[PDB]
Amino acid sequence: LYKEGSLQGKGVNCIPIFKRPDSLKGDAVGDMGFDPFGFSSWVDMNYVREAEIKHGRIAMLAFAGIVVEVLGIKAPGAGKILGSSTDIFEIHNAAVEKGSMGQILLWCGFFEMTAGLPAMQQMLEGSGRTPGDFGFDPLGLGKKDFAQMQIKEIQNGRLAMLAVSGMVHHALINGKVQGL
Amino acid sequence: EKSASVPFLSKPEKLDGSMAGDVGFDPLGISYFIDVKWLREAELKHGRICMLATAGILVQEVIHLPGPAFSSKFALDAWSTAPRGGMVQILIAIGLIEMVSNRFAITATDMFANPNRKPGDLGFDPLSLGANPATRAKYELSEVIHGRAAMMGLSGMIHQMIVSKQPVIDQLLNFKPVDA
């Protein structure tokens, strides 16, 4: 683990209010001694870590997308077909109507079924695959410090999860994702 | 000492975990007085019939055999509209199938007289998909879970159709909450 004992691992507690559960053994990336409800006792650690990485990645992509939608940057021809609305919910409904979101759903589900499900099953059966690993490093950015990249990815994904949730609810309240 | 599914109740003694789908769920203790072989045979038969029932209720709403007799999206109406002679033929064929598949051993006193007879094993493997020991256990667990899920789904479908008086897909697409 990158910065083991300081940033992550055994004996690390991001929130000292809650005691580091013994189940958190510091072997998983992103382990900062936060599990007050002690889910780690019964849950499957590899499955839950893969779920965390997936959620974080989707949240990061969603933050980027919502932001470009609110800023009004649209691909050539997107406005004519879907519309000029900046509201995320209106854009979602319009894209569902046209068929864009349906195709995205189809291909995301195909990728899930063919890659994530077999990979997750093999990992849980003991393939030794690192959670959230698909070999997708075409640009080779992770070869220098793979552990550092892993921790950075997990933390950025968590922050993006919280940010996307906040933005959606701000858009609900005020109509603005900034919710300034 | 305690059942896995229901922690506060003790583990059912007759359920030793050998059978697929065994989570120690027998709160009423049927297995104490009824042979688990008979119970599992009945469970698999019910699950298979309900698998087929759910598939049929969902499919014959969209695809029908030619003819006004077979043209009925509502399944309870199809029960009555389909040719009565044909339905009686299906009943007789099911009876003959039970007899031959069980090899004249169709009673609680003689069903498992042969030691080779295993619960739910009727010699049905036309394509020999179950000859692989590695996947046999997974297939057995999948069959049991599918039977259970299909039983619950078929019950829900039948009674929601009693209530709404509309097909399952038609109900879900044009839902109308219950009023008297």
């Binding site: 002690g38 006792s41 | 229901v6 922690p7 506060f8 109740l9 709160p27 203790g29």
Partner: protein, 168 residues
Amino acid sequence: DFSAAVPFLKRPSNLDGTLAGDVGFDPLGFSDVFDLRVLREAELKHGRFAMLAVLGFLVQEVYTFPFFPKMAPVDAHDYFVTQGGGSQIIFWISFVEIFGVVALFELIQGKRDAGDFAFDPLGLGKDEATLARYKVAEIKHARLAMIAIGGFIHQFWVTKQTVLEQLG
């Protein structure tokens, strides 16, 4: 001996103080003729119902679901009796109580502790000291809420006023 709770009353023989919230209070001697474990299960079931009922009263007074008519908690009973939601709640409570019967038989057989359904989803009672403190707190709150729910309902019947509105 003399009960700790009541100095002038003899400590009931069955009540040895092992159970949580046992202060030797049993003037009418129900424990002498009935199983203390069964009585404790009844006590904790009653107390849990009463605590959830108090919380339900308060939360219903402050908030009601958008899809349900707004009304006082007591009137909600008679409304849902006709509506059919009360029937569903009764049916599902009965469904859980069917397994409760098996749990009670196991308690009689001595396999289970009265009121112990192994229900700790959030794992808040892993350490013993905390577990015993929590059990004492649970029985205390159970009794207090059993009193408080009767107080709430009777006060509503008298004043025809929700408790929150009455307190002002």
